[PDB]
Known about the structure:
The PDB classes it as hormone receptor, hydrolase regulator. 4 copies of one chain form a homotetramer. By secondary structure, the first copy, chain A, is α+β, with helices and mostly antiparallel strands. Chain A has 3 helices and 7 strands. The first copy, chain A, has one domain (1-174): 2-Layer Sandwich (Alpha-D-Glucose-1,6-Bisphosphate, Chain A, domain 4), CATH 3.30.530. The longest helix of chain A has 22 residues, at 152-173. The A-C interface holds A 2-4, 9, 12-13, 16-17, 20-34, 137, 139, 144, 146, 150, 152-153, 156 and C 1, 4-5, 10, 13-14, 17-18, 21-35, 140, 142, 147, 150, 152-153, 156. Strand 1 (28-37) of chain A pairs antiparallel with strand 1 (29-38) of chain C, so a sheet runs across the interface. Residues 59, 61, 81, 83, 87-89, 92, 110, 115, 117, 122, 156, 159-160, 163 of chain D line the site of one ligand A8S.
Amino acid sequence: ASELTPEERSELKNSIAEFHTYQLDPGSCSSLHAQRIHAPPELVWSIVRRFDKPQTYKHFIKSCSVQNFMRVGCTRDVIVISGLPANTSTERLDILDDERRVTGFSIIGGEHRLTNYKSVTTVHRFEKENRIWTVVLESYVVDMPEGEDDTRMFADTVVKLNLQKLATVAEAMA
Amino acid sequence: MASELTPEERSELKNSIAEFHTYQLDPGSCSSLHAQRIHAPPELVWSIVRRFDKPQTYKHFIKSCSVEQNFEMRVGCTRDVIVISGLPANTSTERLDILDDERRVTGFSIIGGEHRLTNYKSVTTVHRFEKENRIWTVVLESYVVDMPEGNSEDDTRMFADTVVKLNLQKLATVAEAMAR
Amino acid sequence: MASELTPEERSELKNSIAEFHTYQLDPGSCSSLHAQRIHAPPELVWSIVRRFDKPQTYKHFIKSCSVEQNFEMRVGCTRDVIVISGLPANTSTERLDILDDERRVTGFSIIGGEHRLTNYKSVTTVHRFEKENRIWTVVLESYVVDMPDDTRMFADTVVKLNLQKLATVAEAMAR
Amino acid sequence: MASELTPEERSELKNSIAEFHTYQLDPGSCSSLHAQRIHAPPELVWSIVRRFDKPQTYKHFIKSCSVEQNFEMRVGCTRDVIVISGLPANTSTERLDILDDERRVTGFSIIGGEHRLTNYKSVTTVHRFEKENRIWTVVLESYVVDMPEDDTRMFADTVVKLNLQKLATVAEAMAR
Ligand SMILES: CC1=CC(=O)CC(C)(C)[C@@]1(O)/C=C/C(C)=C\C(=O)O
Ligand SMILES: CC1=CC(=O)CC(C)(C)[C@@]1(O)/C=C/C(C)=C\C(=O)O
């Protein structure tokens, strides 16, 4: 399910080059994750695109606040409860292309400020012999740790798990 | 749907729920119960669940686990759990409270480790279902914890619920894969 | 990160990062980029860096490195690196991917051995800086590996320490 | 050069070397001694080195370390060291063998955890140098491990040197 076929990988190469390839600052790193979803890509995109409702697919979110709300440069506050004194994160919508199904955001303030976290998600339609399905790609770039508590392992784990929830939610909707 | 019991499942499980997963709460404490359907034999699921020395086999977030040398699994034995960074705690020392191989019940209590969970105690029970010719499992897990001094700090329950739910999902994925 | 690169250094390195240190990732992999400033001439640093047969000069945890007898360095050649960071010493077979003496770029892939499954590939570049008559060096080293048991924090740590050893060595030599 | 003693340093240190860093080795065991010059006051260096509960302050490769709650630092106390992945161990439990604040000497033995370093015992001594009206520190650290051997010795030597290098860096940053 996170393991793409060679057919899928060839089809995704141009999108990876375009949206998921970062020019790194020294002291940073990037990861790319994939998730196959047995649902139509318009349905998956309808969930993914909702900047105000990350809790639908992401774990560890208490709440998300944005009022009479969606545009590039919009911000959200995500209260997360993966920290037990609940933490707030301020995130900005960097990209939103409904025709090409691309969105992304950056963490611009709050507890994980020093991470310079930036992420992009793309949604992709596959069709083989009357069967239609979806692949989601999600990549991020983050600063590497300077100063004991590196959370990049946790960042990868959570993306993986989040994408797994997205597949579950979307497949149950379909 | 994997985490939501059918009426037939919850009818059959009433007595188990009353015996192991029903709590009369003190002030400053919270509990919750989670269910997880697994398409695998209960004896296989139980063989994973009972391994007190290997929680990493079915739990996320565990870097490693150590137990005493010449480990004999008996109630009262402890394990030292090492978690990955990014979480409210990086270690947990846990005590085996119950190990009943006949009835398929375990449970543990968090004794120590630096974290925000105080007096956490959980119980896991494993249940056989058979219909027509098919066999499947339901796992129930409940916990009680002390909630912090923020009054109804729903943060603690929200955090533990997520972890427990994710760990039950992994248990299902692991047992199912093993069944194949 | 030697300590941190200046805005001027970063600006000057943009083009090299784009050319040599940006990877088109496979799903399930990650890439990381480290820098080290070195107060020594670039030709000196490169003379150490380019020696595929002698990684032990700048890298940690190497028991030995062996190559072909009468070694002639060119792309496609391999080395066996016995590493001691595992206590039942492990061996790594690594392939020289790039060598450009004119532009000071080299890189290798792990093709066999204990961490063969990681699909590790790394690139090192050496850069000359001159401002107001002092001359110095920045080294960039990047890698890509599959994500898994997760030894990638060790991989970043060891790259950082290795670059620190390169700086210490080259700076001593320049004296 | 910082890991390399001068003849004047080693001559003064002959006494300390003989007392703490010289070994009568049972077969199947090996020992090694390392040195690190630190341009910082020995009291600062000792204040870091003596902190049995905080080895991450000067050691590489440590994810975390815990000591029993309400810990008081005395010979016989233990710590549980958690190490990042990629190395021969996940964990190490270590016992404080020596803690002499007057003479600036500690040491510890590994008594458990899963790795390949059985009966590892090390001793660390911190030394003052003055000559003349200019002050620096030399740290000596030696260990005895029994092997399953160049490999065991090469590994431990690597860690010890790296850790001494960090100690020097961290101390020198604090002195600034
Ligand atoms: C993953 C993690 C993070 C923490 O902050 C607390 C603790 C370390 C105990 C924990 O292991 C939590 C474990 C829980 C809730 C349940 C379990 O294990 O059945
Ligand atoms: C870094 C590491 C890797 C291991 O495999 C063993 C162990 C966990 C003991 C260790 O902490 C080793 C520590 C050593 C040699 C010395 C020290 O700490 O003074």
